[PDB]
Design a protein around this motif. Structure first.
Motif, PDB file in Angstrom:
ATOM      1  N   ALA A  53       1.377  -1.212   0.131  1.00  0.00           N
ATOM      2  CA  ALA A  53       0.093  -0.346  -0.022  1.00  0.00           C
ATOM      3  C   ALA A  53       0.967   1.053   0.273  1.00  0.00           C
ATOM      4  CB  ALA A  53      -0.909   0.190   1.032  1.00  0.00           C
ATOM      5  N   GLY A  54       0.457   2.028  -0.827  1.00  0.00           N
ATOM      6  CA  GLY A  54       0.827   3.716  -0.702  1.00  0.00           C
ATOM      7  C   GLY A  54       0.115   4.396   0.045  1.00  0.00           C
ATOM      8  N   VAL A  55       0.552   5.824   0.787  1.00  0.00           N
ATOM      9  CA  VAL A  55      -0.181   6.612   1.018  1.00  0.00           C
ATOM     10  C   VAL A  55       0.470   8.137   0.648  1.00  0.00           C
ATOM     11  CG1 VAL A  55      -1.031   7.620   3.295  1.00  0.00           C
ATOM     12  CG2 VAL A  55      -1.261   5.538   3.157  1.00  0.00           C
ATOM     13  N   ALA A  56      -0.412   8.634   0.344  1.00  0.00           N
ATOM     14  CA  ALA A  56       0.272  10.374  -0.230  1.00  0.00           C
ATOM     15  C   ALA A  56      -0.523  11.413   0.253  1.00  0.00           C
ATOM     16  CB  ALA A  56      -0.080   9.950  -1.691  1.00  0.00           C
TER      17      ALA A  56
ATOM     18  N   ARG B 172      -4.453  10.394  -0.074  1.00  0.00           N
ATOM     19  CA  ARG B 172      -4.609   9.181  -1.683  1.00  0.00           C
ATOM     20  C   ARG B 172      -4.441   7.390  -0.592  1.00  0.00           C
ATOM     21  NH1 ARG B 172      -2.992   9.007  -7.656  1.00  0.00           N
ATOM     22  NH2 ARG B 172      -4.051   7.351  -8.242  1.00  0.00           N
ATOM     23  N   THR B 173      -4.852   6.761  -1.186  1.00  0.00           N
ATOM     24  CA  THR B 173      -4.709   5.346  -0.858  1.00  0.00           C
ATOM     25  C   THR B 173      -4.613   4.454  -1.718  1.00  0.00           C
ATOM     26  OG1 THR B 173      -6.312   4.630   0.245  1.00  0.00           O
ATOM     27  CG2 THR B 173      -5.051   5.257   1.484  1.00  0.00           C
TER      28      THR B 173
ATOM     29  N   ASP C  44       8.817   2.658   8.519  1.00  0.00           N
ATOM     30  CA  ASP C  44       7.419   2.781   9.188  1.00  0.00           C
ATOM     31  C   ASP C  44       7.662   3.388  10.591  1.00  0.00           C
ATOM     32  OD1 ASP C  44       8.189   0.446  10.385  1.00  0.00           O
ATOM     33  OD2 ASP C  44       5.805  -0.371  10.246  1.00  0.00           O
ATOM     34  N   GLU C  45       8.879   3.049  10.980  1.00  0.00           N
ATOM     35  CA  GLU C  45       8.950   3.708  12.085  1.00  0.00           C
ATOM     36  C   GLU C  45      10.142   5.118  12.258  1.00  0.00           C
ATOM     37  OE1 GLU C  45      11.088   0.557  14.428  1.00  0.00           O
ATOM     38  OE2 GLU C  45      10.005  -0.888  13.252  1.00  0.00           O
ATOM     39  N   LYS C  46      10.222   5.142  10.641  1.00  0.00           N
ATOM     40  CA  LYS C  46      10.938   6.397  11.064  1.00  0.00           C
ATOM     41  C   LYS C  46      10.259   7.432   9.890  1.00  0.00           C
ATOM     42  CE  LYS C  46      14.598   8.955   9.068  1.00  0.00           C
ATOM     43  NZ  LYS C  46      16.573   8.618   8.939  1.00  0.00           N
ATOM     44  N   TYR C  47       9.067   6.762   9.496  1.00  0.00           N
ATOM     45  CA  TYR C  47       8.564   8.378   8.516  1.00  0.00           C
ATOM     46  C   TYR C  47       6.631   7.690   8.585  1.00  0.00           C
ATOM     47  CZ  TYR C  47      13.018   8.390   6.354  1.00  0.00           C
ATOM     48  OH  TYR C  47      13.666   8.756   5.642  1.00  0.00           O
ATOM     49  N   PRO C  48       6.252   8.917   8.895  1.00  0.00           N
ATOM     50  CA  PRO C  48       4.522   9.358   9.170  1.00  0.00           C
ATOM     51  C   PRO C  48       3.879   8.973   7.948  1.00  0.00           C
ATOM     52  CG  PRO C  48       5.267  10.761  10.594  1.00  0.00           C
ATOM     53  CD  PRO C  48       6.500  10.485   9.229  1.00  0.00           C
ATOM     54  N   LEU C  49       4.617   8.377   6.621  1.00  0.00           N
ATOM     55  CA  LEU C  49       3.314   8.706   5.613  1.00  0.00           C
ATOM     56  C   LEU C  49       3.790   6.410   5.780  1.00  0.00           C
ATOM     57  CD1 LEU C  49       2.743  10.614   3.474  1.00  0.00           C
ATOM     58  CD2 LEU C  49       3.906  11.241   5.291  1.00  0.00           C
TER      59      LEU C  49
END
Length: 200
Positions: free
Chosen positions: A20-23, A58-59, A129-134
């Motif tokens: 998955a990608g999140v923007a 957006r996902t 995922d432990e360093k970037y909110p996105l």
């Protein structure tokens, strides 16, 4: 915008690979939801958090079934298959810069290959995922999607555990399935665990 991409289920013997990608246009609004410490959340709380994320960002989700994973793994490793999914999601989102989780501790190579494929800016890191909110957000979406599928599979084939070779329950159920000679389609056949279990 900027985007975060991650996955869930890469190491499972059962179930799909979910990428998955999140923007988001408002990254602060994303942080207010508490994505940074989403790891302590339950399946139910995480599912609610996933919905809130879809509301403000957006996902893009991509799912690869066990069957398709087995087909593709004849000519590629799971990590390369992952990179493939990553580039696909990055190309859907077309972000200014994409941050992605790196299966390997050393990220440089994946970053290169991804920038090469996407022609876009790409920053990869092990445990991103432990360093970037996105990425934390993308990680949440993938896990929830994966779990939804897993639950769906359990309604049909019974409780096979978590789906990872770790879970004692999973290995136990895995052994009987193979023994019966009638293995459910949700099992990844080209998986080492399965191979070894069948060889003996």
């Amino acid at each position: 915008m900027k985007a975060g991409i991650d996955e869930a289920g890469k190491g499972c013997v059962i179930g799909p690979l979910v990428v998955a990608g999140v923007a988001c246009s408002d990254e602060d609004r994303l942080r207010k939801l508490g994505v940074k410490d989403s790891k302590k959340l339950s399946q139910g709380r995480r599912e609610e958090l996933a919905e809130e994320i879809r509301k403000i960002c957006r996902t893009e989700v991509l799912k690869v079934s066990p069957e398709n994973l087995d087909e593709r793994m004849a000519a590629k490793t799971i990590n390369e298959i992952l990179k493939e999914c990553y580039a696909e999601i990055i190309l859907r989102l077309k972000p200014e810069i994409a941050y992605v989780d790196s299966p390997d501790v050393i990220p440089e190579r994946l970053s290169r290959e991804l920038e090469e494929i996407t022609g876009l800016r790409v920053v990869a890191e092990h445990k991103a995922d432990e360093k970037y909110p996105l990425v934390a957000a993308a990680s949440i979406i993938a896990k929830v999607e994966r779990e939804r599928e897993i639950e769906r599979l359990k309604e049909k084939f019974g409780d096979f555990g978590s789906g990872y070779a770790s879970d004692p329950r999973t290995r136990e159920v895995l052994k009987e399935w193979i023994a019966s000679g009638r293995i459910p389609s949700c099992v990844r056949m080209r998986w080492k665990t399965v191979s070894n279990l069948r060889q003996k």
